[PDB]
Amino acid sequence: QGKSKATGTGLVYVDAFTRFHCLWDASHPECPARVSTVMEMLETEGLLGRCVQVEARAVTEDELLLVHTKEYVELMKSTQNMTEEELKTLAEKYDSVYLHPGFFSSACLSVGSVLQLVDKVMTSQLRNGFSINRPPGHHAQADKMNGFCMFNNLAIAARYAQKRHRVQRVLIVDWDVHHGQGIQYIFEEDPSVLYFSVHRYEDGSFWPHLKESDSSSVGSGAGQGYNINLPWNKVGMESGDYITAFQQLLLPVAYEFQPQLVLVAAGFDAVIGDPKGGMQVSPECFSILTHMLKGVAQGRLVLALEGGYNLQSTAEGVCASMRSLLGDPCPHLPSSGAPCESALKSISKTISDLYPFWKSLQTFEGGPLSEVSPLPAPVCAEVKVSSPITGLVYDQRMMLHHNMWDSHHPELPQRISRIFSRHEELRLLSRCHRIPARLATEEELALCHSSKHISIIKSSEHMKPRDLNRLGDEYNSIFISNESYTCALLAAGSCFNSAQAILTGQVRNAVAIVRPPGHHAEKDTACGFCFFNTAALTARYAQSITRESLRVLIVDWDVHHGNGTQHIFEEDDSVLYISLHRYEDGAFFPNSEDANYDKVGLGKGRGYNVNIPWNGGKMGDPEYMAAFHHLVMPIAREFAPELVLVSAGFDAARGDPLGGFQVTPEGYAHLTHQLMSLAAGRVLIILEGGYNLTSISESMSMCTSMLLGDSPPSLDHLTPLKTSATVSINNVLRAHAPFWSSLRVNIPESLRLSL
Ligand SMILES: [K+]
Ligand SMILES: [K+]
Ligand SMILES: [K+]
Ligand SMILES: [K+]
Ligand SMILES: [Zn+2]
User: Fold this and answer.
1) Which of 138, 139, 561, 630 is catalytic?
2) Which one of 41, 306, 656, 672 is most buried, counting C-beta atoms within 10 A?
3) What distance in Å separates the CA atoms of residue 390 and residue 734, rounded to the nearest whole number?
4) Within 13 Å, how many C-alpha atoms sit on residue 142's CB side?
């Protein structure tokens, strides 16, 4: 691997795409200036030179006939030789169409451009690609033109992928503001292709004015379940509406479908300023939506230009998508990370209409969730996008903390040396920027810990063994050594240096290979192998070097609940703590009911503490992924953090001696990939628990691989879920829906109980 890795982004553009235009209406919205403005901006932004130039080719007859009829193809071919009057006379026969003697030539190159990128991506020459092509395609049907489309580019490309590259399952995502009814028809009774379209509808009042554009059209025959319409029934939708639809509906379904290729009908008429869409999505949104789709199909992703009729807005939308293909860090979302009621209705309605067919959607119990006014959903100041640098911090001195009386205690020094070695083997170390380690100050520790607790541990640099054994027994599950203080100082100060590097723009994200852990340590006591809460301290340090009100998200996927972390921020609305953890109705460590789902924080901090408790089974990727789709990411998005810290305990990992759970290194990669679209990519991953040296070295290397931008890995089946996990997920939905609107899926109990 390495030199042979598929990393490039393919771009197809040919001057032929400008050679045809409307002859009888010089004001027609589908015009040459569309693609040439996209190309002009791609160069102005410096994105064009970063793409691999891929040549266009003419689609062949047998390729067209994967979708179209020979009678229709030959009619379209014959247009080359028609007069303007003949062309107009033929165009009249179709809904919203014009013709031009060069239309057929460019249409053939428009289809073939997608096939070229599919070739390059499935033969693993390139990571992904984007054709800047016109005419568009998603409205075209087997035997007729429609909606400025002659041939259905992506439908042909889907079947081409299956026939020539032996792809089994293709996902087509259609975020163009119109319904791509041509694609829906073509794959109506075909479960080898899953078609998702999100589009303006308003109860059929918006073109194409079809009953079948509604969420009730789920496909038929063998294809029933594999066609999904998300119709917006009010105009003015924003990024939070699209992003919530992707979180609550599309991504669960897509991860369950396990496609091998994603084709995107990338129309940008949903963007601010488009004269036909009437929506208000900011271009930045399509950096997010693109990043999301890189999760399924191991990043095998091909975008093709569909609609988009404001020239700047379309070009800005393409640039926002291209930056994500090129692996640039996501922007801060300009709008709020919260959906509106009409979006939640359309989303819930579509979930309900598809609920029988998708076991991921069946995660929802149903019944009414809250409709109280939610917490504020703020927006973050713009951070200028730059090439992503991943920081890495590690120092061998953090091995010196140890247990003299029990050589077999799981918090082994070698945890961080094995993790670092695996980074050096997989060459991740040389790809990262090496952040220097440093000691936290007493002043910095005072940001969360009492001067008593600080002074106690400070004396341990000198306390003798038998005192260290007594002291350890004053705490729940703690051992101590004469270096434990210095190690805990580095585990904090190294995360400070990382947070400083992130927030000053020296790096964009970072990984901190540190011990001892912190997320159990309290204001005033050590606990659960932790002395100082380096996660909480780092959040405060971030607030100290930026501004006191800087929003920070702490995600804790350690199998243990970080009680100390919960408490330090239980009244705080400037820091959001989300924890996934084993609980067993209170039996599992730390044996406190603080870790239950109904502990939503206290005071101004109500809603700013999310507990996802696991009971009754081996939990793994399927449950942790569903928790992220339905809880972690919706809430995090709505909170709109400016920095993400991860209490990264790999003790939920397969083969961990303490957790008993079966999260895989591939799962951890996808959890990391999810979080990378938050906080404009400002993620810092801090090691907590996890004690199987093999599983943690593999898991954290995968996390860093994601931070560095590599394609997400393959996964086991993510359905069915354990039923206790389903129950606990819905408990968090009910607990936190009054605070967070992105959670408010309202599907009736009737559908759950009708299966
Ligand atoms: K659509
Ligand atoms: K289908
Ligand atoms: K369109
Ligand atoms: K946790
Ligand atoms: Zn742990």
Assistant:
1) 139
2) 306
3) 37
4) 10
Q: Which residues are annotated as a binding site for Zn(2+)?
A: 176, 178, 269, 556, 558, 560, 565, 569, 575, 580, 599, 647, 651, 736
Q: Is 139 a catalytic residue?
A: yes
Q: Which residues pair with 666 in a beta bridge?
A: none
- Given the structure tokens 């809250």, which residue do they identify? 370
Residue 144 Cα to ligand 1 middle (Å): 19
d(CA 149, CA 558): 51
Ion ligand 1: residues, CB within 5 A, are: 174, 176, 197, 199
Resolution in Å equals: 2.4
Centre of ligand 2 to C-alpha 267, Å, is 20
> Do 668 and 703 meet the contact criterion of CB atoms below 8 Å apart?
yes
605 C-alpha vs ligand 1 centroid, how far in Å? 39
Contact 210, 197 (CB under 8 A): no
Q: Which ligand is nearest to the CA of 137?
A: 3
- Run of H or E residues at 752: helix 749-753
* Residue 463 region by backbone torsions, left for phi larger than 0, else alpha for psi between -120 and 50, else beta: beta
CATH number of 391-743: 3.40.800.20
Assess whether 179 carries a catalytic annotation.
Answer: no
Q: How close are the terminal C-alpha atoms of the chain, in Å? A: 47
For the chain, give every domain's residue range.
9-362, 391-743
CA of 560 to the centre of ligand 4 (A): 5
The C-alpha atoms of residue 164 and residue 123 are separated, in whole angstroms, by 11
- φ, ψ (nearest 5 deg) of residue 580: -110, 135
Residue with tokens 């259609």: 174
**DSSP-derived 3-state class of residue 281:** strand
**Annotated catalytic residue: which of 199, 332, 449, 520?**
520
Q: CB burial class (10 A; 0-12, 13-18, 19+) of residue 515? A: buried
Location of structure tokens 């569309």: 34
Write out the E strands in 120-226.
Answer: 128-131, 170-174, 193-200
Phi first, then psi: give them for residue 652, nearest 5 degrees.
-75, 0
Deposited experimental method: X-ray
The single-letter DSSP state of residue 595 is G
Number of H helices, E strands in the chain: 26, 16
Number of Cβ atoms within 10 Å of the Cβ of 291: 23
Ligand nearest to the CA of 207: 3
* 670 alpha-carbon distance from chain centroid: 8
The CA angle 213-214-218, to the nearest 5 degrees, is 95
Buried b / exposed e across 695-715, counting CB within 10 Å, b at 16+? Answer: bbbbbbbbbbbbbbbbbbbeb
Q: Please, are residues 469 and 391 in contact by the beta-carbon 8 Å criterion?
A: no
One-letter amino acid for residue 35 of the chain: V
DSSP string, 161-179: HHHHH----EEEEE-SSS-
Q: What is the second-level CATH architecture of the domain 9-362?
A: 3-Layer(aba) Sandwich (3.40)
